[PDB]
Amino acid sequence: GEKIMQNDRGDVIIDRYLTLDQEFDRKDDDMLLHPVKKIIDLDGNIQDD
Amino acid sequence: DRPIDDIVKNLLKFVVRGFYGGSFVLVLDAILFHSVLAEDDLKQLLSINKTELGPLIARLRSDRLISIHKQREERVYYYVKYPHAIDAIKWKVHQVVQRLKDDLDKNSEPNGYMCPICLTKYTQLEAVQLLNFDRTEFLCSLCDEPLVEDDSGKKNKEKQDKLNRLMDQIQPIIDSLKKIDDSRIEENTFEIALARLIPPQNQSHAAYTYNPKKGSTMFRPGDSAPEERENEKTLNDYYAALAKKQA
Amino acid sequence: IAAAALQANQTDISKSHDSSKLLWATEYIQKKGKPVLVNELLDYLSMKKDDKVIELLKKLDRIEFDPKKGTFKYLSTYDVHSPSELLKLLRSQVTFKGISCKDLKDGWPQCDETINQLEEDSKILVLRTKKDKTPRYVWYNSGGNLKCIDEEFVKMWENV
Amino acid sequence: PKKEILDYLFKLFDEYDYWSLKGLKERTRQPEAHLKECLDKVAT
Amino acid sequence: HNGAPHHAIEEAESLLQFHVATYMDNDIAGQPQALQKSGRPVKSIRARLKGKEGRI
Amino acid sequence: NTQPTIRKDGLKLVGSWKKDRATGDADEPELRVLSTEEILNIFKHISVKDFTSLGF
C-alpha cells in the first residue's frame, strides 16, 4: 500500500517485472469480470435513464 | 496493451506503406517490432550503413515521427513521439485536404488564358481588360499576341475524381484518427519505450537504460509535456525398519 | 594419356591433414545430391575402419548418419524448399534479421525464382540491389501491399 | 597447387594463429586471388 | 537533407551566419577579416555608409 | 525554471545554468550554445505588453 514515486529508484532488476505485473493485473481483472444480478446492479440503476 | 495503440502502430504501417519508400517501411516496422534501438544494432540487423541511414532518419525527423534520443553510457536511441506524430499526421492530412479541395474549387472556376510567346498565364479578368477594339478576342500587352484559353475545364472532373479516390484510399487513416480521438493519448518517452523494451539482440553493445542527472536543468524541445509388486514395497519397508534401528 | 597423368598426380589418401581428408570428403558429400552410404566413403577414402575422422563426421551437424541404413546425408542451412514453408518460417521469425539468398539456395536452389514471384505477389519484404533487382535479406510482409497507392498520388504526396 | 598450399596453410597457422595476409603472401609467392579464395574457405 | 553526421552541421551553419554577418558588416571585432580576391577586403554596407564620402 | 548567465562570444551565445538545486551546490553550468531557433521561438512567446515595456 505505497504510492509509487519517481524520487524512489527502487531495484532495477525487480522493477523490470513492473509491466509484467501490470499485464498480470489486466489478465486477473479480465478473469475477475462476471455478470451481476439486476437486484443489486448499480450499473442497471445508473442505466435507468 | 491497449488495442488503440495497436491500431496506431498498424496505422503507421499503412501510412508508410502507402506514402513512403520501402526502406522507410522496413525501418519503421523494425523499430516498432522492437523498441528504442542503438544505431549499430540497426546496422547489424539490416546490414546497412550510415550513408543509407542518413536520408531516411532525416526524413523521419522532418515529419516529426520518431524522436531521437541520445545518452552517454554517447548512445543514440529512437522512439516514436505519439502526440507530436499524430498531430503532424493530422496537420499534413488537413493540409492535403484543404489543398486538394481548394484545387477543385479553383478548377471549377474558368480556366483563364495565356500568352505562349512570353509563357505567362492570364486570368479571365486579365483577358477582359486586354481585349481588342472588336470586342471579340484578347491581345497581349507585351507580345501583342492573341490570348489562347487555358486548358483546365476537363481537368475539373479529373481532379474531383482524384480527390474522391484519394479520400477512399485515405479513409482507413480517417477511421483510425476517429478512433484515436475517441481514445485518450499518453505521450511517449524514451523511458516509456524502455518499459516496453523489445531486445532484438543478445549481443547488443548499448545499455538500454536511462541514467538521470542531478544538478542539471537542461531543457530542450521534443521532450515537453506541459503379488510381486507388493513385495518390493514391503522390502522397501524392510530397509526402512532396519535403517531406523541403527538410528 | 590424360588419365595416366591424372593417376600419377592423384595424391594418396594419406594426406598431410585429417582435416584436409575430411574437407575433401565433405566436398564428395556435397557434390552428391543423395544421402550416400558409408560404402561411398570407403570408396572415396581408401580405408575401412571407423576413424576419429569418421567419428567427427558423424559429430558434424551438416553430415547426418542414417541409423536405418548408413546413408550419410548432407544437412543444409534451411529445410525449406516450398514457399509455404518459407512463409511459415517468415511468420515464425522472432527478430527482424533478414536472410541471404545463398544459404537458402543451399537446400532450395529454386528459391530465388520463388522469392521473385513472392515479391511480385508482394507477400514478402525483399531487399534488392540498385544495380539490378538482386534479392538479399528478406522479411515477412507484416502489412498489406507494398504497391498500395498509385504513382501519381504518391508523386503529389511527395509534392506535399 | 590447391591441395599442397592447403596443407601448407595448416602448418602455417599452426605456427602462428594470427597469421597476417602479408605474412601469408611472403610464405606463398603465389597468385593472390588464388591465395585469397583458399584462405577464407577454411579459416581467417 | 542527406546524411547529417552532426559534426559538419555546426560549422556549416556557423559559416552561413558568419558570411551573412560579413555581408552586413565587415567592421566587427577583429577575430575575422573575411577578404575576397584580391587582398583588398570586401566592403560591406557599413563600409559603404561610413563617414567621409560613404553615401551620406 | 532557472536562467543561465549568457556569455557573449564570437558570433554566437552560450549559456551557463548554475541553478544551485542539486542535492549539493549544483556546480554544473550548462555550457550550451543557445540555438537561434529556440531564441526565435521564445521571442515569439513574448507579450505585446512586454514589447511596450521593452520599447518595441
Swiss-Prot record, chain A:
Signal peptide: none annotated. It is found in: Nucleus. It comes from the Eukaryota. Disulfide bonds: none annotated. Component of the 7-subunit TFIIH core complex composed of XPB/SSL2, XPD/RAD3, SSL1, TFB1, TFB2, TFB4 and TFB5, which is active in NER. The core complex associates with the 3-subunit CTD-kinase module TFIIK composed of CCL1, KIN28 and TFB3 to form the 10-subunit holoenzyme (holo-TFIIH) active in transcription. An additionnal subunit, TFB6, plays a role in the dissociation of the SSL2 helicase from TFIIH after transcription initiation. TFB1 interacts with XPC/RAD4. XPC/RAD4 recruits TFIIH to the NER machinery. Interacts with the NER 3'-endonuclease XPG/RAD2. Belongs to the TFB1 family. Component of the general transcription and DNA repair factor IIH (TFIIH) core complex, which is involved in general and transcription-coupled nucleotide excision repair (NER) of damaged DNA and, when complexed to TFIIK, in RNA transcription by RNA polymerase II. In NER, TFIIH acts by opening DNA around the lesion to allow the excision of the damaged oligonucleotide and its replacement by a new DNA fragment. In transcription, TFIIH has an essential role in transcription initiation. This is General transcription and DNA repair factor IIH subunit TFB1. It comes from Saccharomyces cerevisiae (strain ATCC 204508 / S288c).
From Swiss-Prot, chain B:
The keyword Transcription applies. GO terms for biological process: transcription by RNA polymerase II; transcription initiation at RNA polymerase II promoter; transcription open complex formation at RNA polymerase II promoter. It is found in: Nucleus. The keyword ATP-binding does not apply. A zinc finger (C4-type) spans 115-143. Keywords: Metal-binding, Nucleus, Transcription, Transcription regulation, Zinc, Zinc-finger. Residues 8-90 form the HTH TFE/IIEalpha-type domain. GO terms for molecular function: RNA polymerase II complex binding; zinc ion binding. One of its GO terms (cellular component) is transcription preinitiation complex. Belongs to the TFIIE alpha subunit family. Recruits TFIIH to the initiation complex and stimulates the RNA polymerase II C-terminal domain kinase and DNA-dependent ATPase activities of TFIIH. Both TFIIH and TFIIE are required for promoter clearance by RNA polymerase. TFIIE is a tetramer of two alpha (TFA1) and two beta (TFA2) subunits. Present with 35900 molecules/cell in log phase SD medium. This is Transcription initiation factor IIE subunit alpha. The lineage of its organism: Eukaryota, Fungi, Dikarya, Ascomycota, Saccharomycotina. The chain holds residues 2 to 369 of 482 of the full protein.
UniProtKB/Swiss-Prot annotation, chain D:
TFIIF is composed of three different subunits: TFG1/RAP74, TFG2/RAP30 and TAF14. This is Transcription initiation factor IIF subunit beta. The chain holds residues 295 to 338 of 400 of the full protein. TFIIF is a general transcription initiation factor that binds to RNA polymerase II. Its functions include the recruitment of RNA polymerase II to the promoter bound DNA-TBP-TFIIB complex, decreasing the affinity of RNA polymerase II for non-specific DNA, allowing for the subsequent recruitment of TFIIE and TFIIH, and facilitating RNA polymerase II elongation. It is found in: Nucleus. Belongs to the TFIIF beta subunit family. Present with 520 molecules/cell in log phase SD medium.
UniProtKB/Swiss-Prot annotation, chain F:
It is found in: Nucleus. Transmembrane segments: none annotated. Disulfide bonds: none annotated. The tandem 7 residues repeats in the C-terminal domain (CTD) can be highly phosphorylated. The phosphorylation activates Pol II. Phosphorylation occurs mainly at residues 'Ser-2' and 'Ser-5' of the heptapeptide repeat. The phosphorylated form of Pol II appears to carry, on average, one phosphate per repeat. The phosphorylation state is believed to result from the balanced action of site-specific CTD kinases and phosphatases, and a 'CTD code' that specifies the position of Pol II within the transcription cycle has been proposed. Signal peptide: none annotated. The C-terminal domain (CTD) serves as a platform for assembly of factors that regulate transcription initiation, elongation, termination and mRNA processing. Component of the RNA polymerase II (Pol II) complex consisting of 12 subunits. Interacts with DEF1; the interaction is direct and serves to bridge RPB1 to the Elongin complex in a DNA-damaged dependent manner. Interacts with the Elongin subunit ELA1. Interacts with the Elongin subunit ELC1. Interacts with ASK10. Interacts with ESS1. Interacts with RTT103. Interacts with SHE2. Belongs to the RNA polymerase beta' chain family. This is DNA-directed RNA polymerase II subunit RPB1. It comes from Saccharomyces cerevisiae (strain ATCC 204508 / S288c). The gene is RPO21.
